[PDB]
Amino acid sequence: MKAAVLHEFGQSLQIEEVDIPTPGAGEIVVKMQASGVCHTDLHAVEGDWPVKPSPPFIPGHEGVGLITAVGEGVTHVKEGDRVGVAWLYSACGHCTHCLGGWETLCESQQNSGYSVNGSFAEYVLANANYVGIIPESVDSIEIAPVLCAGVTVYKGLKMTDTKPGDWVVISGIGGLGHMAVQYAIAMGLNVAAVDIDDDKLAFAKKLGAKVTVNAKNTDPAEYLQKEIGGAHGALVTAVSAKAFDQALSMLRRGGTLVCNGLPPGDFPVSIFDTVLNGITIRGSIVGTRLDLQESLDMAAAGKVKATVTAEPLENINDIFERMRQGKIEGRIVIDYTMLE
Amino acid sequence: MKAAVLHEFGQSLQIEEVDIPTPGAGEIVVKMQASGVCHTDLHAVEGDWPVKPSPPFIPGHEGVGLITAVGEGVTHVKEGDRVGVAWLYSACGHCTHCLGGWETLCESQQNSGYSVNGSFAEYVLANANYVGIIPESVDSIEIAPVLCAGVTVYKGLKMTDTKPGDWVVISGIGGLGHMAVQYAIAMGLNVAAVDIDDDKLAFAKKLGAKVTVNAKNTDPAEYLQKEIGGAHGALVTAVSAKAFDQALSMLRRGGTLVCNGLPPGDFPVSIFDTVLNGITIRGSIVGTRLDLQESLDMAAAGKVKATVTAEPLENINDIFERMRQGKIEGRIVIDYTMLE
Amino acid sequence: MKAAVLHEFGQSLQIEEVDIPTPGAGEIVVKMQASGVCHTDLHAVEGDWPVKPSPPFIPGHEGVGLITAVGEGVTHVKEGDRVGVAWLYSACGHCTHCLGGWETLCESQQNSGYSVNGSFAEYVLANANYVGIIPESVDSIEIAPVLCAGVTVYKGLKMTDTKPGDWVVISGIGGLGHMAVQYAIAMGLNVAAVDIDDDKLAFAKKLGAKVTVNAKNTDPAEYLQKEIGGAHGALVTAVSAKAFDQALSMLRRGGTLVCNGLPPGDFPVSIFDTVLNGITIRGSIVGTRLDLQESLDMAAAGKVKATVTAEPLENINDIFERMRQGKIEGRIVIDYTMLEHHHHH
Amino acid sequence: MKAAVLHEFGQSLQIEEVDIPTPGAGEIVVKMQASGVCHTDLHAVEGDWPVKPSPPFIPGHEGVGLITAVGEGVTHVKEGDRVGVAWLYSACGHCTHCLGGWETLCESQQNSGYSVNGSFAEYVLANANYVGIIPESVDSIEIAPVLCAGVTVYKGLKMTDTKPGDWVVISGIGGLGHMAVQYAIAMGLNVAAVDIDDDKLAFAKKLGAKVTVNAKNTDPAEYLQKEIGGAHGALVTAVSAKAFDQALSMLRRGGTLVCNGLPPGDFPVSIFDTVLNGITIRGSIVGTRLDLQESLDMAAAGKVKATVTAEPLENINDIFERMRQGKIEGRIVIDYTMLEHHHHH
Ligand SMILES: [Zn+2]
Ligand SMILES: [Zn+2]
Ligand SMILES: [Zn+2]
Ligand SMILES: [Zn+2]
Ligand SMILES: [Zn+2]
Ligand SMILES: [Zn+2]
Ligand SMILES: [Zn+2]
Ligand SMILES: [Zn+2]
Ligand SMILES: [Zn+2]
Ligand SMILES: [Zn+2]
């Protein structure tokens, strides 16, 4: 089967031939129709993070396709079912985290396209108990980004501890952020969108953000303090020092900021004002099986729709380069019927 | 009446004579039996913080005493009632924070012994709707610190989002921390105490902390990771950079760190690890009327007891000096029957 | 000033002349532009409930108007401000319930148009700390029902412990229920509406209910168990024994049923199944000051709109007779600028 | 192996010989050291409930013993590990309930000693992912009741939505109730115990209940309304109509009642007052794997200790007869090392 393989961190991936896997007990093989690509896949192939892949490996944790083989003992899915291969490839199922519905925190979890081969190949070996069940009505290319961007922003909004009618700021209206506006609206929130690109901000308004502000033209924190009295919640999708700090300043007292991705390093942080104002700072970066199901249902109900561009597998190094310089709009999805 | 008056930030307070106030509508005058002193009074008299007192003023926000006059329209308390004058002097009662039981966040709150005269005088003018109602059974000197330290650590423990049977770390077993260990036990938590003083740590163990570690002799984080698998929550009572950072490292994934006081400045912060591990950082520094009532009931039930030392008002500058170099043990309380 | 006064339980109210009150400390006087009417006013004037009014009294707990006098010490509102007089007239502000944001539970509360005079008069004396602050942009007649129906169904939906994407059944799509469907949609819920009137159910669908069932034609519980796998939550706006029991049966395991009004009596209840299925049964019947503010903001955002019919004060006994036989649609609101024409002789 | 087998509902169980099972994938066999016995086993063997066992079957859902065989693919436990066989034998792992940490609600769950063979035999085949992990330090006979009574009352107290310093009433201080008082104390709650037996009530006080009331001598509700201003929560361990109704009356407004077991039938219920007072009624009858783990940790910490009486397997019909007339104190546990002495002829 065709796969994009990373042999050495920071090298181009090689489209090459590899064996189709076969499933052991508890496993399935899924033939990919589509695979999302995101910045996480870029961190994987550059070996950026403290805990790294072991090359050679196949990246990708946003695969949609049909089950072509079922392993021993699997009964809740079957051949022909359409499923999703997401970041959480497996978890132990016995620890305090797994037992309490927080399997995203399991210390022995495996991650698709990172600690094991992923969705950048024509076929993927998966743990049947951890794949997403894809709703009937949806398109495979369009739904793929829900498996990563969608579930992420959705769980991240839940982690803002906000409620219908509250105001949430979405900082950064890119790959994640355009999904975040949509989930926030579906969750009955009023949205304030902040970015530095005017078109992104128009897109946000079209997706239902009643307030927008361009951080390059205007102090976002002064404007939102005056306009909405400060946000109840903030979801920071592009974590740079400045966006984080501005997002803190955009909150009312008792507000919650959720960092929805990993910044590159530490960066100084208010503390003093943070405690005075009863602020909460939390990370949230993926979602549980149930979060992913809820995410997918919202999409199937038409409440959320990803902007995608479909490309052949062969373009994956080009795609990374464009990513390296924020040239991507919406999300990029590999389409496995594009036979170059 | 006798009062300790601050005329100029950073100068000695003068014990001097001032008029006994009389109460307008909604107010009461309380003759003090006791007044706690804490670092917040020190920040008030040094004019350390961004928003400052307007000298000349009388500090103190931990006064216990008997009502001697009642203003127009006050019916729920009356002459002779023993009440507590705490940090929260008043709040607006109309804003979203006040209406939802978060009056500690009210943007037009007044603060005793900071924005208005407080408990470092023989009598105090107070808003009848914001004083604490002192339980029958308790001693006035002993109960005073509940009005500031006790409520603070109590609400702080609530804000760790822990539950009975969880492990909480109390970092710093000093004025606040020794009360914190007791509230944590009363709330069914297992307590790990960290400090750098061996006697403080023995005291903690005597108050019910099953685990103790001296941060000077041992990496506290490595030790608690191995010993208890990481704490579910951390209450940081002495906020220096190093204690904060170590406290982060003591948490298990999904844990919550509450800062229970104000540090002096910003200080770098993990972020990256914080988000990866699904950690929450939160500030909590005082408590609502209801929190204060709940704090006081726990004390009256004998579940919590402050270590206090009673001193005459005249010693207040000496007391501040000893504070400036960590010479205080437990809490210091001004005793208004100590007549010089 | 003109007021509708109840002198004897169960008798017609008399439109008569009464002194305009003047405000003491902490109080205000509000000149009414509009007053909602509801079944709670009917229970009040019939003296139906265990704890009753003391006649003579002026009913009404859904008044919207402008402040015309401000008492001593009141500073957060002022003359000309538009405010709402609601069921919770006052609470003590000192008890556990009041301190914890649950003033609706205060054992010494007062209730507008029940334990003190209310909104069925051209002016009303009120406690300044308990009136609702009416958003700028709304109409006074249209907004009045938010003070009672809206806040009730809003807080009741919060009390279902559901979340966006969950399914809630609204049982009874009448005065309350039509507002309930709108709030439930604004709160990101999927809505299944149940009633026994087809037109009510069409209205519900128009308000965004994706699923509807006529309990007369079809077993509502069997249908919703098959169709949505059981609701996560149920809000019972018309509490008869049969609606209550069916609503229980419409829930999935771990679901929550909220009774949003007072039934007439006891009525047997499942228990056994309720405990087996991990079901929660809860009452929620009004809302705090903050719940009311949040309700009102939703309305002002255009997310909720009450169906109303405006009438002159002098129709209040006709209104109650219609109510006595389920003839009302939406809500009725007294409009203080509407006049009679007697067409004299 | 020796097993107590129920062949016909309502008949004596037969101690007879049955094959030791062998484990398939995902399964283990556990050699029992101890087995609790409770009213749920009695309902099972009488075939009392709407959904019943399929005889012949081996009852028991409180087994403690050592793994003697491990099936294919099992890695998180191993031979010689001490584990607990509890009511929740298995769940699907794939539905909304299972994925959200509410596996106790799973519609395709299996129940030990009810829908599959349980702990009334010397060996039990179990699903490795659902057995409890027994802390090192505890005794096997003493810990067995935690697997059923303990987890039940523990999760039930969590479901009262109380917090440390609140007042909870434990109604019925028997098998479940005497554990409930200990858990409630460990959870920082003040405890009011109610029952109709003075000795039970003294025991409760000894376990830390600072308030007690004998419902036969005194109106429990009037007393607790005066004494503590009404409880925040109530846990009803013996569900008869009268206990349930009195427990409702013991709550303050906004209070929560949890029914911790299954009454025999429906029984009228307040509603009207319930909704007026903002009261919540909830069933909670067992616990998740995590609840069970937490229960067990509290016991191992010395915070909770079950009163038990150890008996040989062969007494199981005698045990059920004593149960049939409330002759049991604390809990009964079968101890697999205990032997009869027939004193033969
Ligand atoms: Zn290769
Ligand atoms: Zn991704
Ligand atoms: Zn795990
Ligand atoms: Zn002076
Ligand atoms: Zn202080
Ligand atoms: Zn305020
Ligand atoms: Zn009404
Ligand atoms: Zn009150
Ligand atoms: Zn049992
Ligand atoms: Zn299941």
Side-chain angles (χ1 to χ4, degrees):
Chain A
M1 76 176 172
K2 207 150 53 139
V5 185
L6 181 289
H7 289 102
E8 224 58 68
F9 289 127
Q11 288 172 357
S12 301
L13 284 72
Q14 194 179 335
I15 306 295
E16 67 191 37
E17 197 76 26
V18 317
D19 297 345
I20 297 169
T22 59
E27 307 177 321
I28 53 176
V29 174
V30 186
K31 183 179 205 278
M32 296 288 94
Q33 297 155 327
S35 176
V37 185
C38 82
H39 284 271
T40 282
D41 291 303
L42 183 58
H43 291 303
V45 303
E46 251 154 23
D48 257 351
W49 281 342
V51 178
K52 310 148 139 63
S54 336
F57 79 103
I58 297 169
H61 47 273
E62 288 170 54
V64 177
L66 304 186
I67 293 186
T68 49
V70 173
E72 189 80 5
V74 177
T75 68
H76 75 107
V77 291
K78 67 193 211 298
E79 262 193 51
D81 288 358
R82 185 170 52 168
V83 302
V85 168
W87 172 250
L88 185 65
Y89 177 91
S90 68
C92 78
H94 332 119
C95 79
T96 296
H97 298 311
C98 290
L99 298 183
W102 281 105
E103 64 263 30
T104 48
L105 300 183
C106 172
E107 300 279 355
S108 43
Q109 68 186 256
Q110 289 298 304
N111 301 115
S112 300
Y114 201 97
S115 71
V116 291
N117 287 342
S119 64
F120 288 18
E122 293 182 305
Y123 294 80
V124 184
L125 174 68
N127 178 314
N129 290 342
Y130 287 90
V131 300
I133 303 308
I134 306 299
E136 278 311 342
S137 58
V138 303
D139 176 89
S140 292
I141 301 291
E142 286 170 4
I143 199 74
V146 175
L147 307 171
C148 163
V151 69
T152 292
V153 303
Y154 172 70
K155 174 56 166 290
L157 293 169
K158 301 205 278 194
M159 294 299 91
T160 63
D161 291 334
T162 46
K163 68 179 182 322
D166 283 352
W167 282 91
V168 70
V169 326
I170 310 297
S171 173
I173 309 305
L176 290 184
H178 88 283
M179 302 216 76
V181 173
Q182 300 177 65
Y183 275 99
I185 293 302
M187 299 166 75
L189 301 173
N190 301 298
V191 178
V194 186
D195 207 308
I196 53 83
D197 174 318
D198 283 325
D199 299 333
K200 277 165 197 228
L201 293 167
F203 184 29
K205 174 167 162 186
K206 189 225 251 71
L207 299 174
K210 276 88 196 157
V211 165
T212 68
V213 48
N214 193 315
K216 231 77 205 39
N217 304 324
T218 311
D219 177 352
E222 290 177 17
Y223 176 78
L224 296 179
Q225 291 300 332
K226 198 256 268 297
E227 185 75 8
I228 60 177
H232 303 75
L235 186 76
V236 179
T237 64
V239 203
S240 67
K242 192 167 93 178
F244 179 88
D245 188 52
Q246 287 170 356
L248 285 174
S249 294
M250 284 174 250
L251 294 169
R252 67 182 51 206
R253 290 184 173 170
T256 304
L257 188 153
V258 175
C259 289
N260 219 190
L262 297 140
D266 273 1
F267 47 49
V269 163
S270 294
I271 282 300
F272 188 103
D273 284 352
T274 285
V275 18
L276 191 71
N277 290 325
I279 306 290
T280 291
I281 292 165
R282 181 173 276 160
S284 175
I285 56 57
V286 68
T288 66
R289 296 168 295 170
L290 180 56
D291 295 323
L292 171 58
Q293 180 185 107
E294 290 168 13
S295 287
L296 286 168
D297 289 352
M298 279 189 194
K303 282 166 178 175
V304 174
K305 166 54 73 67
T307 298
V308 301
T309 307
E311 285 202 34
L313 178 72
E314 289 77 5
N315 280 1
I316 186 52
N317 297 302
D318 284 350
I319 284 163
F320 285 145
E321 175 49 38
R322 249 176 280 145
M323 193 172 293
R324 269 187 209 96
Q325 36 221 20
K327 296 336 302 273
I328 311 291
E329 16 215 3
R331 294 282 283 211
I332 304 294
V333 181
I334 294 154
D335 174 357
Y336 285 101
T337 76
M338 281 170 176
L339 300 187
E340 261 219 352
Chain B
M1 74 178 172
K2 203 148 55 136
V5 183
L6 183 288
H7 287 107
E8 220 53 353
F9 293 128
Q11 75 166 197
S12 301
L13 282 74
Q14 196 179 332
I15 306 294
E16 67 191 38
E17 197 72 28
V18 317
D19 296 343
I20 297 168
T22 59
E27 302 176 327
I28 54 175
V29 170
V30 187
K31 183 179 208 275
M32 293 286 94
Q33 294 157 326
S35 177
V37 185
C38 84
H39 256 73
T40 282
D41 297 304
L42 184 56
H43 289 302
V45 304
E46 229 117 23
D48 261 351
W49 282 342
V51 178
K52 311 147 139 63
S54 336
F57 79 105
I58 299 168
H61 50 277
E62 285 169 56
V64 177
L66 305 186
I67 295 184
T68 51
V70 172
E72 185 80 8
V74 177
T75 65
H76 78 287
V77 292
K78 66 195 211 298
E79 264 190 51
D81 284 359
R82 184 168 55 168
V83 302
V85 170
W87 177 248
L88 187 68
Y89 184 92
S90 67
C92 74
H94 329 122
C95 70
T96 292
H97 293 314
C98 285
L99 295 183
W102 281 101
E103 63 264 31
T104 42
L105 299 183
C106 171
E107 305 277 358
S108 39
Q109 72 188 254
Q110 293 298 306
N111 299 115
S112 298
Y114 199 96
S115 70
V116 292
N117 291 341
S119 58
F120 282 12
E122 282 181 310
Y123 294 79
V124 184
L125 177 68
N127 180 313
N129 292 339
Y130 287 86
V131 298
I133 301 309
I134 309 298
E136 274 307 345
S137 57
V138 305
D139 173 87
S140 292
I141 306 289
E142 288 169 6
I143 197 76
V146 175
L147 303 166
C148 161
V151 66
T152 284
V153 304
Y154 179 64
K155 171 59 164 291
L157 287 169
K158 299 205 280 192
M159 287 302 94
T160 62
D161 290 335
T162 46
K163 69 181 184 322
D166 282 348
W167 284 91
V168 71
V169 325
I170 310 298
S171 173
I173 310 307
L176 292 183
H178 89 283
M179 302 216 75
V181 169
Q182 302 177 72
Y183 278 101
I185 291 302
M187 298 166 75
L189 301 172
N190 298 301
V191 177
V194 185
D195 208 306
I196 54 83
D197 174 320
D198 277 335
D199 301 331
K200 276 165 196 226
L201 293 165
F203 185 30
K205 175 167 159 185
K206 189 214 172 93
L207 299 171
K210 296 290 192 159
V211 164
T212 66
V213 48
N214 194 319
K216 207 40 50 46
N217 302 325
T218 311
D219 180 351
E222 288 177 16
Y223 175 77
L224 294 178
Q225 289 301 332
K226 213 23 77 295
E227 185 76 7
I228 59 175
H232 300 80
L235 189 75
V236 180
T237 66
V239 203
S240 66
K242 189 168 94 177
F244 182 85
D245 192 50
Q246 283 171 355
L248 287 172
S249 289
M250 284 173 250
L251 296 170
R252 67 182 52 207
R253 288 182 172 171
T256 299
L257 182 155
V258 173
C259 287
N260 222 189
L262 298 140
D266 276 0
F267 47 51
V269 162
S270 295
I271 283 301
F272 185 102
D273 283 352
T274 286
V275 18
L276 189 71
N277 292 325
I279 306 291
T280 293
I281 295 163
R282 180 175 277 160
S284 176
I285 57 58
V286 69
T288 62
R289 292 168 297 169
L290 179 53
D291 296 322
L292 176 57
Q293 179 187 106
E294 289 168 14
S295 286
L296 290 165
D297 290 352
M298 277 187 195
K303 284 165 178 176
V304 175
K305 167 55 72 68
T307 298
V308 302
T309 305
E311 286 203 34
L313 182 67
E314 285 82 6
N315 280 3
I316 187 53
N317 298 304
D318 276 348
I319 282 163
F320 284 143
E321 177 48 37
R322 248 177 280 145
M323 196 173 291
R324 271 187 208 96
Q325 35 223 19
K327 299 336 302 272
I328 310 292
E329 17 216 5
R331 294 283 283 209
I332 304 293
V333 181
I334 295 153
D335 173 356
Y336 285 99
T337 75
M338 277 174 88
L339 296 189
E340 288 210 2
Chain C
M1 78 177 169
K2 202 145 57 134
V5 184
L6 186 287
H7 290 288
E8 212 191 350
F9 291 127
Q11 295 292 295
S12 297
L13 283 75
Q14 312 296 315
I15 296 301
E16 64 191 43
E17 196 74 26
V18 319
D19 294 352
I20 293 170
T22 63
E27 303 179 323
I28 52 174
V29 171
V30 189
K31 181 179 207 277
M32 294 287 97
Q33 288 160 322
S35 181
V37 188
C38 83
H39 285 273
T40 282
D41 295 304
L42 181 57
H43 292 300
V45 304
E46 229 111 33
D48 260 351
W49 284 338
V51 175
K52 313 146 140 64
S54 335
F57 79 104
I58 296 166
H61 50 275
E62 287 168 57
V64 174
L66 308 183
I67 294 185
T68 51
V70 171
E72 189 80 6
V74 173
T75 66
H76 80 285
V77 293
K78 66 196 210 297
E79 266 191 50
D81 286 356
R82 181 170 53 164
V83 303
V85 169
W87 171 251
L88 184 68
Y89 181 91
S90 66
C92 66
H94 324 125
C95 79
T96 301
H97 295 310
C98 290
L99 292 182
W102 278 105
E103 59 264 30
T104 47
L105 299 184
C106 171
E107 300 279 6
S108 39
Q109 67 191 258
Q110 290 298 307
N111 299 113
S112 295
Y114 202 97
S115 70
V116 293
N117 285 339
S119 59
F120 282 12
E122 286 181 307
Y123 296 76
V124 183
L125 177 67
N127 182 312
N129 292 338
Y130 289 87
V131 297
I133 303 308
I134 308 295
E136 278 305 345
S137 61
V138 306
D139 174 89
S140 286
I141 304 291
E142 284 170 5
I143 198 76
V146 177
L147 309 170
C148 165
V151 65
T152 289
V153 303
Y154 176 64
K155 171 57 164 291
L157 288 167
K158 298 207 278 193
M159 294 299 93
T160 63
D161 291 337
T162 48
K163 69 180 182 323
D166 284 352
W167 281 89
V168 72
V169 323
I170 310 298
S171 172
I173 311 305
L176 295 186
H178 91 281
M179 303 215 74
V181 174
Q182 303 178 66
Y183 277 101
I185 295 302
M187 296 167 75
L189 303 172
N190 297 300
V191 175
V194 185
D195 207 305
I196 54 83
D197 175 319
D198 281 335
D199 296 334
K200 277 167 195 226
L201 287 166
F203 187 30
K205 170 169 160 185
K206 189 215 172 93
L207 298 171
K210 294 291 193 158
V211 163
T212 68
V213 49
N214 193 318
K216 210 39 50 45
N217 301 141
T218 311
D219 180 351
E222 288 177 16
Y223 175 78
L224 293 178
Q225 292 301 331
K226 204 255 268 297
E227 180 78 8
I228 60 175
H232 300 78
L235 186 76
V236 178
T237 63
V239 203
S240 66
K242 192 167 94 177
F244 182 86
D245 194 55
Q246 283 171 356
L248 288 175
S249 293
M250 286 174 248
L251 294 171
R252 66 181 49 206
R253 289 182 172 174
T256 298
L257 184 158
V258 173
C259 285
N260 219 191
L262 296 141
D266 278 1
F267 48 50
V269 164
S270 297
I271 284 300
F272 183 105
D273 287 353
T274 280
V275 16
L276 192 71
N277 289 323
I279 301 292
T280 294
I281 293 165
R282 183 173 275 155
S284 174
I285 57 56
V286 68
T288 63
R289 289 168 298 171
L290 181 53
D291 295 323
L292 172 58
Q293 178 185 107
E294 287 167 14
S295 289
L296 285 165
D297 288 354
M298 280 187 193
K303 284 166 177 175
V304 177
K305 166 57 71 68
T307 298
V308 297
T309 302
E311 287 202 35
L313 183 68
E314 284 81 5
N315 279 9
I316 190 53
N317 295 303
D318 282 348
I319 288 162
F320 280 141
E321 178 49 35
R322 257 175 280 147
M323 194 170 294
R324 272 186 209 98
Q325 35 224 18
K327 297 335 303 273
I328 307 290
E329 18 214 7
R331 295 282 282 207
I332 307 296
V333 181
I334 298 150
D335 171 357
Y336 283 102
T337 70
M338 270 182 74
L339 301 185
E340 308 196 276
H341 192 330
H342 298 149
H343 297 273
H344 292 296
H345 345 104
Chain D
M1 76 178 171
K2 205 144 59 132
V5 181
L6 184 287
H7 285 290
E8 210 194 347
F9 286 127
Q11 293 292 295
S12 299
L13 284 73
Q14 311 294 313
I15 297 299
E16 66 192 42
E17 194 74 27
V18 319
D19 290 343
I20 299 170
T22 64
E27 302 180 324
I28 51 174
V29 172
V30 187
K31 180 181 206 277
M32 296 289 90
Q33 291 158 323
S35 177
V37 185
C38 84
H39 284 275
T40 285
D41 296 305
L42 183 57
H43 290 300
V45 305
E46 231 111 31
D48 262 349
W49 286 340
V51 174
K52 311 147 139 64
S54 330
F57 79 105
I58 295 167
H61 48 272
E62 286 168 54
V64 174
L66 304 186
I67 297 186
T68 51
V70 172
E72 190 79 7
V74 173
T75 66
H76 77 286
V77 293
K78 65 196 212 296
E79 263 191 52
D81 285 359
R82 186 170 51 165
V83 300
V85 169
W87 174 249
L88 183 66
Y89 178 91
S90 67
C92 71
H94 330 118
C95 80
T96 298
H97 298 310
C98 290
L99 291 182
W102 279 102
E103 61 265 27
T104 45
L105 300 185
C106 171
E107 299 277 2
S108 40
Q109 73 190 256
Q110 290 299 305
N111 300 114
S112 301
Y114 201 93
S115 69
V116 292
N117 282 339
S119 61
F120 286 13
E122 286 181 308
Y123 294 78
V124 183
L125 177 67
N127 184 311
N129 293 339
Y130 288 87
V131 297
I133 305 307
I134 302 299
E136 276 307 321
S137 58
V138 304
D139 175 269
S140 293
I141 306 291
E142 285 169 3
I143 201 75
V146 177
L147 302 174
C148 165
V151 67
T152 291
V153 303
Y154 173 68
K155 173 56 166 289
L157 290 167
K158 299 206 278 194
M159 290 301 92
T160 61
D161 287 340
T162 48
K163 68 184 183 323
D166 286 350
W167 280 89
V168 72
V169 323
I170 313 297
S171 172
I173 307 306
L176 290 185
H178 87 284
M179 309 214 74
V181 170
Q182 302 178 66
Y183 277 102
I185 292 304
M187 294 170 73
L189 299 172
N190 299 302
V191 174
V194 184
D195 206 307
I196 53 83
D197 177 319
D198 281 335
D199 299 333
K200 277 166 196 227
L201 289 166
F203 188 29
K205 169 169 161 184
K206 186 215 173 93
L207 299 171
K210 34 271 153 276
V211 164
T212 68
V213 50
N214 194 317
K216 210 39 50 45
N217 302 141
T218 311
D219 179 351
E222 287 177 16
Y223 176 78
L224 293 177
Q225 289 301 331
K226 202 255 269 297
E227 180 76 10
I228 60 176
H232 305 75
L235 188 76
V236 177
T237 65
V239 203
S240 67
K242 192 166 93 177
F244 177 86
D245 190 54
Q246 283 171 357
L248 284 173
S249 292
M250 285 174 248
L251 294 171
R252 66 183 51 206
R253 289 182 170 172
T256 299
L257 185 156
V258 176
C259 286
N260 220 191
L262 291 141
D266 277 0
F267 49 50
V269 163
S270 298
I271 283 300
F272 185 105
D273 285 352
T274 282
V275 16
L276 189 72
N277 289 326
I279 300 290
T280 294
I281 293 165
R282 180 173 277 160
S284 174
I285 57 56
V286 68
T288 68
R289 293 167 294 171
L290 181 53
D291 295 319
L292 173 61
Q293 183 186 108
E294 289 167 16
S295 285
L296 284 166
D297 292 351
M298 278 187 193
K303 283 166 178 175
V304 174
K305 165 56 72 69
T307 295
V308 298
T309 303
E311 287 202 35
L313 180 67
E314 285 82 4
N315 280 4
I316 191 52
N317 295 303
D318 280 347
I319 287 163
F320 282 141
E321 178 48 36
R322 253 176 281 149
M323 195 169 295
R324 271 187 209 97
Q325 35 224 19
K327 299 335 302 273
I328 310 289
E329 17 214 6
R331 295 281 281 206
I332 305 294
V333 185
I334 295 151
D335 171 355
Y336 280 98
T337 70
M338 273 179 76
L339 298 187
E340 309 195 283
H341 193 328
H342 294 151
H343 296 274
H344 293 294
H345 348 103

